[PDB]
Amino acid sequence: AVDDWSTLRRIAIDAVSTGRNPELKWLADHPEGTPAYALHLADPLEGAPEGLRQCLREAWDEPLDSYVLSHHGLPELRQAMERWFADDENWPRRRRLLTTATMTGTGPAMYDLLRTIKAREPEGPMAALVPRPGWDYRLFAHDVGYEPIGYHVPFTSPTGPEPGDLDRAVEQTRAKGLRPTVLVLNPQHYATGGNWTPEFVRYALSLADTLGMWVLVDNAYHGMTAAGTQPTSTVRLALDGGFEERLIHVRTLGKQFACNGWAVGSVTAMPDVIDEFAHRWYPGHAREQAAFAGWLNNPESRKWADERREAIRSNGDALLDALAEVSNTTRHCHGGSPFVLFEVPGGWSQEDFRQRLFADTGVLLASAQIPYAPDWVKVFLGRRPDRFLPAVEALRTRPSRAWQPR
């Protein structure tokens, strides 16, 4: 019965404009004293696991407020992070890649990695091959001086692009007179729920090697596939295939541990690359770095992550059942990243639909943002069940004409 309104008010309401996104106006107009549930972002508002917050609390009296004098972050965090991800992703022990810590988000990290690659490569016309739909890679690419070229990602298939989808992007890059310079992969895919095939990832890695392209793999959701799913590990496939020199792995700790605002993540690449990245393109936030190191070295973190994969599975099942009671549109729950997709009832468009649904039920859902299929909705599943299931209940019990085709 516990909702999100008090927290949404604290983080989204202000006396000046809070942003251009429509949902911020809906929140500003939301009736005070009535429930509101936020399922539109991969961002659990109930907060981080207690074990992590306890690490932060217990160090309040330690001198952790200054600059951090290693540009790569605290060694204790670098080590605990590389350990946790290498185990999670079954990295081989025989590797030359080194791991550096990032403290202001992996968005900024991939922006500066695109600049790092650009600095290492001969000046010329540069394409970044990015998944479409996908996360925000195209925005960083454009601002750094690459033309972003989308490769098709089907949302109706649990298994992601086929090799021919990549080939078509390479062909369009050549037709535009550009060199294919970096390929972004995101096999636990934001935000279709896909878990791309080892077949396609191996194809992508071999094609990149043939073309001399860099491969940037974003593994934000690798550890958050629904229980019973086997996530494809790009680093394992790449190193076993002998593609290492131009591999860059990026992964936020925030999506993994319900703490997006902590902004701690990791970048793993060849030594010369992480050296240029960290020095050319002092850090801070030692309190977050010290707290994460203690948490990741605690076996409770692995237990909590395992339990969360089971919650993602059961949460999706519960949402699917509710959607079946209130609606008759197509639904997907592919299990590869923690999102459910469903089609907007006929005669509605997705924005009007979500606005009306939020007014009638208090449940705020997100546009799926699929460019070739705009009128689909996406629902994030990576929340504690005691905070996700009340939102499902509101959908199942509060009537709305949003569900009825026009």
Place this chain on the structure above:
Amino acid sequence: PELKWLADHPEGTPAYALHLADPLEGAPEGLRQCLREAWDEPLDSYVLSHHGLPELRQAMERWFADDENWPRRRRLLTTATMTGTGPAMYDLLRTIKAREPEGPMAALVPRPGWDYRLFAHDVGYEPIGYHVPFTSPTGPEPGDLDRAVEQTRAKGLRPTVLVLNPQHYATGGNWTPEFVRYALSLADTLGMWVLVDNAYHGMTAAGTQPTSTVRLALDGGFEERLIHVRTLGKQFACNGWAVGSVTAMPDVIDEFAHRWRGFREYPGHAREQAAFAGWLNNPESRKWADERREAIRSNGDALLDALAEVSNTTRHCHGGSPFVLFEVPGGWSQEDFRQRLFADTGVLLASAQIPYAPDWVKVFLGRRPDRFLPAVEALRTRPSRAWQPRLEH
């Protein structure tokens, strides 16, 4: 180089690292208490407002407007910064570029000064330095700005941005109202944006009145292209927290927040921001800041006294930003001097980095007296030949 010396330092003797603008202290206890007490609140998520956490944006706007004596009525809007005022100035420079016609642009920056030239070059401005005299406690004169404008004109560049830093990193200067007024009126005539960095505004030695650029600007009507930037880090002994503020006209902040910052960074660090709002909204934060200006004054006096005891060179303590400057004895480069001094005394100092005066040292004063004064005593009681001239006429 300095970090290397620190590593070869013998274990068993005190080392005092005074070469950074960082006290290597815990942040004020009240601030850390605010962080600790909120450990069980749900503050781990992204912030959904593109200005940062509302309670912090509001508290820091109020605290700075009081500290800097801003007029109560103004159209400027204040946003929070969550990744450093360096990235913020990078994004502000890009916001300005997007609003001006294309063509070659100069950014006028203080020389010596902070690293504004690095951001300006990166975004595609040519950085043009204006002379900042370090011997005067009041900094540049109007003709120093006029010279940079004429250099800009001779290179066929449009002067597009002027960066002002009146509590100056890192000379100690406190620039005069007359100079800042001249700079604002000249920028307005030329259509230049004024970016004022006020990192050290609240950090002047007690008894020194910092010049408030925003007050002078708004009194004179120079609002439309004014941008204020100010970190909380240097003042409140918490460089690692990367919380600060930017204030500009509403349309400028919106583009900065939505497009230039907003297409790269997602707002976060709600824990730091809530802790700062609790601190700034506590009367103890103002009391602590006042007590800190007294500590900066007494620290600088104590260093000057110790220098008079062990040395016979020119020294400055201008009182406008928390730095003491002094000249190395004859026959010493600044690097050899600081390396010898650190070896003999355990006290590590910084180069002043004055390009027209290389062999000078600077000393940051913003640290607790019970931690600064032991370093001063080390300089007095540990003999060093660094203080003796190595030249003879």
